Design a protein around this ligand. Structure first.
Ligand SMILES: [Zn+2]
Ligand SMILES: [Zn+2]
Length: 128
């Protein structure tokens, strides 16, 4: 059985003392990723950079509205920095197609190369 409910998951995380860990542990337990991230119409011929002013998905990505892929925005809670600043809100986020089932998890787990603007491990081809 069990019917599933996005709001159940978001409620659980929103009211957790550590929402990021709550979501991470929930996924690790086999939980269904947060759905309904807002997928954009785009050419799929963009730069493939992680977080952009307009959609920039390449052939191997999807572009989504940034806030819809942000755990803190989606939970309607303050962001984890003194300023309360969200890097995603008002922007567009590119998610590799293999991970597009869980954009919120993807943005939580991953980091952007400050040099090339691509996701580390998913686009950055800078020398190591
Ligand atoms: Zn946010
Ligand atoms: Zn890079």
């Amino acid at each position: 059985h069990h019917h599933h409910h996005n709001s159940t998951v978001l409620s659980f995380c929103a009211f957790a003392v550590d929402p990021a860990k709550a979501y991470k542990d929930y996924l690790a337990s086999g939980g269904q990723p947060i759905t309904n991230c807002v997928k954009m119409l785009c050419t799929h011929t963009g730069t493939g950079q992680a977080i952009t002013v307009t959609p920039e998905a390449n052939m191997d990505q999807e572009s989504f509205g940034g806030a819809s892929c942000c755990l803190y925005c989606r939970c309607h809670i303050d962001h984890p920095n003194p300023k309360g600043f969200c890097d995603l809100k008002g922007k567009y986020v590119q998610i590799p197609t293999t991970c597009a089932n869980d954009p919120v998890g993807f943005t939580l787990r991953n980091t952007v190369c400050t040099v090339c603007g691509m996701w580390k491990g998913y686009g950055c081809s800078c020398d190591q």
